[PDB]
């Protein structure tokens, strides 16, 4: 349910990180803006079950490294 | 149950991700649209048992990497 | 009982994925149709114990990769 | 008691998979027919403690791969 | 929820480490200043769910090493 | 709510007819397979409010005749 | 719910007319066999919602005339 | 339900008209014999849901005229 | 259930009009004899559900005109 | 039961119009005499279910015009 | 029972219009005298079930136009 | 009893319209005077069951147009 | 008693529309003045049973169009 | 009292649409202003029994099309 | 009250559709924006008694077709 | 509230059909995506009062045929 | 809420002043017509929170003078 | 609500000053006539919220001087 | 909290004015559309705390004059 | 606490306006995005005590005009 995290590094100005709500109905719960060079370490919690990343960014997860260009 | 997640990156405009309900009767409970470049990190929960992906996409799971061509 | 999943990619149109009921009695409980190129990430739940795959498909499990040619 | 499974692929027409009942007395529980090319993913449960395979088949388990020639 | 930590080393003067709150609402909860050379070992707790790092820094996590340039 | 029906004739193999559930939440209810040449007469009821047709088919309604090319 | 009927004339031996059950669940509830030349005038009732016709037959409804070639 | 009727004229000796019961179990509940030239005007009721006609006969319904050759 | 009528004109001496009983069991309820040139206008009621006409006669119904030669 | 009527015009002296009773038993209830030229507009009621016309007369009903020659 | 009417125009002096009674027994309930050129619009009601017209008159009903020469 | 009306236009001075009462007894209840060129739209109501028109007038009813030459 | 309306267009200055009361006793209850060109759509209601039009006007009803010259 | 509507199109600037009260006393209840080109679809209700249109306008009703020139 | 709808197609960008409330008071309740090419099918309900259309649009109703130019 | 339906055929990929909520508040309640060639028959219910169509589509209603070009 | 006013002078015929309601919901509450040369002094009150001015007009407020060119 | 006044000087005979009511519903509550040369000092009060001036007049308020030409 | 206002003049067609909600959470509470030349005088109230203006407009506040070019 | 406001105009794309909470703890409470040209008029309230502006913007307060360059 918990105890797993992602590492997101912003490779450009204005990168959006959106957390979707946990439960029967899914809606936006929070978002964060990151500037060029920022690093965020985010954890899965009792109110967040999905994470969307908009903008150019570099992401590290247990399954490896990925790059978003949104 | 929980504590396991998939990583989906959209390689083209209009990628659809559909979540299926947990219980005896199975029916669509939510869908998400992804544009070219966006990344979604999704978790299995008490209201999601299966995940369906339509469109050209790149998927990372604990068992490896796969690509959907739909 | 839970917390393990399979990955199924349909290599041809009309692939059938059938789930069998958990309990003293056994019969069909649901099935899903997959079009060419689609990917399903399915789990094991309290109402499903066995999974049958009909049609040409590519399967990833904890024990490796297999190909069904039904 | 749970959380373990086997993967059986039928290499010929008419492959039989038999489940044996869990409890003080051991007795047949159900049988399944597989045609050439199909795949079954079967889990150990609280109503099934042993699994028997008749016919030419290819089996993947945690301990490796085996081939039945019955 | 717990039992995981990050290691941050400040590679320049004036590095800021910000902790975010665990709960229904997300709010800034605390920040720490690091001078050129200091090392902070920070854990995930019941009152913390995310950590942001502003400034040039070297970060070690379970998923590897990253560098923030901001 | 009742006393209205549609006539569907399958012009090709594998035509799918899907019923959508009546109520606050809209969800799949049942699907039917039609082979080349068969005819189905379906009625609107208190458990079905919408009907979806996939595949090459010929449809007669109170408003006239239509042809689906799916 | 009622008060509407269809006319089915069998143009060949062994024409099958199947009635599906009205309710939350759907399954076969009755079927009738028609010999060559026979005519059935069937209604819609509280236990029947849909009608399926297998075999070569001539059908008259409020929307016109159709021919099944199953 | 009621308030709808059919007109059958026998064009040969030995025409049989069979009525089917209204309810869950469908069952023949009565039959009538018609000789060459006789006319029967029959109505749908709370104990009749379907009507079957064997023999050479001329039938008039709200949807038009049909002829049975049985 | 009611409120519909037939018009019968006797084209020869001794024309018999028979009314069958309404209910689970069907038996003769009444009959009338008509002489040449006479006209009867008959209504469907709570005790009559079917009508037989024996002898040469001219009949008008909502569906059109028919001639009996019984 | 009601809400329908016939129009009878007497084309010769001495025309008889007979009403039959509505109920379990059928019995003559009333008769009327019409002279050459008179017009009677008669309704169907709770105490009448059939109408018989003896003598030369011209009759108009919802189904058209008829002539009694008796 | 109600809600229908006839239109009578008197073509000669002294035209009689007689209304018969509704119930088990039939008797004259009222009558009206019309002079040449007058027009009466008369409705079927809870106390009138049949209408007789004596005298030369022109009558319009839902079934058409008739002329009384009594 | 309601929901039906007539249209009367006076083609000459002094046209009288008389309304008759609804019930067991029938007596004149009201009259109206119309001057040349004037139009009255009158309805059948709970207290009116018949209408007389004296004088030269033009009348429109559901059954057509008539002219009173009084 | 309701659900039926008339359309009145005034073709000259000072056109009068008078409403008559619904009940045992009949009297004027409202006058309406229309100027040259105005259009009124008026409904039959629980307090109005007849409508009287004075002046030059054009009237549309279910039975057709009429001209008032009062 | 409901279930009937009018369609008004304004052919000039400043067109007034007035609704009159439903009941014993009749007074103004509301008005609407329309500009050159606007279309209003208005319904009869529990508080409106008449509608008056002032100004140049094009009106469609169940009885046909009219034009106001106020 | 219910059970009647209009079809509005936007022929240009920025078409406004306004619904007016049902009750003693009349107020603007909701509006909808339509862009060029969009079709809206709108029903009459318990909270809507009038519909106002601003902008160039094509409207279909039971009375025919109209065009707004606002 | 019920007993009416529309027929939508999708002439291009990704056609959106949106349903609006019934009540004092109006908001998006559900939507459906249609592929090129697919046909949806949709009914008006007690949770839906309006329908929007986005994309190139062909629509059949009681008032005729329309084409959306959104 | 009070103690503040605006001065509006009409520079042309037909100037409309509209007052909006104070509360959670916002609907038009009253409007006023001004002819050329006329002057209105209006106050903000417990029931008014906004004022719209349509038409060519000259407005004085505490912040200065403005001109509406509607 | 108080403590603010306007000064009105009449520049011609017959100048009208109209006071509007303070409350949910707005109506005239008082008219004042001024002759050529007279001066009125009027206060905003608990029963007056707006003031309308008709005629040629000179007005002084806190925002300056205005001239009415009505 | 109250007793202050802004003056907005629309310099172009389609200017949007949005009012945000007063309280712990901020959301769109109402909006208004302005056509070219219209003027709105808007007050701060117990349910509005912030105002956004989209579109070309001219704004007067206690701090001076500003022009929005959105 | 209240009764004072700031005026912010966005001079470039992507301007952020952040509100801080009133109470014992200071935390971010809300943010707003402004596009190039938009104007926001924001008040001080019971839930807000400070306002930060990120991005190129033009600000008007009681103390004068300021320009943010960030
Ligand atoms: Co944001
Ligand atoms: Co969607
Ligand atoms: Co299936
Ligand atoms: Co077997
Ligand atoms: Co027999
Ligand atoms: Co006999
Ligand atoms: Co007499
Ligand atoms: Co007005
Ligand atoms: Co809007």
Residue numbers in the entry:
A (entry chain E), B (entry chain F), C (entry chain G), D (entry chain H), E (entry chain D), F (entry chain 0B), ...: 3 to 72
List sentences quoted exactly from the publication behind this structure.
TRAP has proved a useful building block for construction of artificial nanostructures. The wild‐type protein forms a ring‐shaped assembly comprising 11 identical monomers. We have shown that cysteine‐modified variants of the trp RNA binding attenuation protein, assemble into cage‐like structures with Au(I) or Hg(II), called TRAP‐cage, disassembly of which can be induced by thiol‐ or phosphine‐containing compounds. Here, we report variants of TRAP which can assemble into TRAP‐cages mediated by Co(II) or Zn(II).
Based on the crystal structure of wild‐type TRAP, a histidine residue was introduced at position 33 of the TRAPK35C variant, yielding TRAPS33H/K35C, where the histidine and cysteine residues are located at i and i+2 positions of the β‐sheet motif around the rim of the ring‐shaped structure. The cysteine residue at position 35 of TRAPS33H/K35C was further changed to histidine, resulting in another variant, TRAPS33H/K35H, possessing a pair of imidazole ligands. When the TRAPS33H/K35H protein was mixed with Co(II) or Zn(II), it showed the formation of pseudospherical cages with a diameter of ≈22 nm, similar to TRAP Au(I) 24‐cage. We constructured a number of cages named as follows: Cages made with Zn(II) (TRAPK35C‐Zn(II)‐cages); TRAPS33H/K35H with either Co(II) or Zn(II) (TRAPS33H/K35H‐Co(II) or ‐Zn(II)‐cages); TRAPS33H/K35C with Zn(II) (TRAPS33H/K35C‐Zn(II)‐cages). To verify our designs, we solved the structures of TRAPS33H/K35H‐Zn(II)‐cage, TRAPS33H/K35H‐Co(II)‐cage, and TRAPK35C‐Zn(II)‐cages using cryoEM single particle reconstruction (see Methods for sample preparation and Figures S2–S4 for analysis pipelines). The resulting structures showed that these cages are mainly composed of 24 TRAP rings, and the overall shape and bonding network between adjacent rings is retained when compared to the TRAPAu(I) 24‐cage. They form two chiral cages, and each ring forms two metal‐mediated bridges with each neighbor. In the structure of TRAPS33H/K35H‐Co(II)‐cage, every bridge has in its center one ion in close proximity to the histidine residues introduced in positions 33 and 35 as expected. However, a closer analysis revealed that the coordination geometry is unlikely to be a perfect tetrahedron but rather a distorted one or an octahedron formed by 4 histidine ligands from the protein and 2 bonds with other ligands such as water molecules (which are not visible due to limited resolution). TRAP‐cages that possess only histidine ligands, TRAPS33H/K35H‐Co(II) cages, and TRAPS33H/K35H‐Zn(II) cages, almost completely disassembled in the presence of 35 µM EDTA (1 equivalent to TRAP monomer). TRAPS33H/K35H‐Co(II) and Zn(II)‐cages were more sensitive to pH, disassembling completely at pHs below 4–6 and above 8–10.
